[PDB]
Amino acid sequence: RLKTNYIEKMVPLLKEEFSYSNILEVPKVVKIVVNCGIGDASQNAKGLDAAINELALITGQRPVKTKAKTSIAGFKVREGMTLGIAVTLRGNLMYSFLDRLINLALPRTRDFQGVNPNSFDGHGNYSVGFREQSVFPEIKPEIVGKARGMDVCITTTAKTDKEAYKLLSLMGMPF
RNA sequence: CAGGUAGACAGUUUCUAUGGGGCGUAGGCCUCCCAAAAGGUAACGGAGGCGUGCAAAGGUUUCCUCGGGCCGGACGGAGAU
């Protein structure tokens, strides 16, 4: 449905709105990294496992084990400790997962405005964020530590920014 | 025979480097400069280190390759994923 809608409404409008040419070379999502950072500073392995076994449900894919980059900060943080995870889906697993947030999960969240600020990175890429009060068909508020949010960075093959929101707007993403 | 005490007595040591000696400091090895474009080459002449660490930071095969900054994102208000 999400993937099918792409080549039957999404791409079409992307051919008339922008420069007229072939079929491809149009804004197309390549991956969706819904990273979910964990409360740093506090040295606890519980929060780490509570994260890896958290996103592995909504995406059904084993998270990552990023390591603190070697640097000299103010805190007493060392290099070699895991403090975050970022899963990215591709192909069908991407369009399918992306269709979820669009259809379900939202506006399931109580009091969901939808008005997004400026944002944008500067190269056909868009990213969003969810507060510590979200909801997903996979998430179970029955056996979890504490309500925590996560980040969702969706990158596309768009060249410019004006070709980023034009792909998510006609797609179904709240705007 | 043997354990203490035993310079009262006897035999000696108690360094050198150092533009006096002495005090201090300096008296191997490893990096740069003074050595004036092959090396070698002085002076307590100018700035820093070592007397180890490591079943592996050993070898090999494959693969992966930064720092920092800008524009964005829940927990960001200078840096953290």
Curated annotation (Swiss-Prot):
Quote the subcellular location field of this record: Plastid, Chloroplast
Q: Which residues cross the membrane?
A: none
**Which molecular-function annotations from GO does this UniProt entry contain?**
RNA binding; rRNA binding; structural constituent of ribosome
According to its record, what are the GO cellular component terms? chloroplast; ribonucleoprotein complex; ribosome
| The keyword Transit peptide belongs to this UniProt entry's keyword annotation | yes
Q: What domain of life does the native source organism fall in?
A: Eukaryota
* UniProt GO BP: translation
**UniProt keyword terms in alphabetical order:** Chloroplast, Plastid, Ribonucleoprotein, Ribosomal protein, RNA-binding, rRNA-binding, Transit peptide
Assembly and oligomerization = Component of the chloroplast large ribosomal subunit (LSU). Mature 70S chloroplast ribosomes of higher plants consist of a small (30S) and a large (50S) subunit. The 30S small subunit contains 1 molecule of ribosomal RNA (16S rRNA) and 24 different proteins. The 50S large subunit contains 3 rRNA molecules (23S, 5S and 4.5S rRNA) and 33 different proteins.
What task does this protein carry out?
Component of the chloroplast ribosome (chloro-ribosome), a dedicated translation machinery responsible for the synthesis of chloroplast genome-encoded proteins, including proteins of the transcription and translation machinery and components of the photosynthetic apparatus.
Q: Which family does it belong to?
A: Belongs to the universal ribosomal protein uL5 family.
- This protein's name: Large ribosomal subunit protein uL5c
Naturally occurring in which organism (per UniProt) = Spinacia oleracea (Spinach)
State which stretch of the full-length protein is shown: 56 to 230 of 258
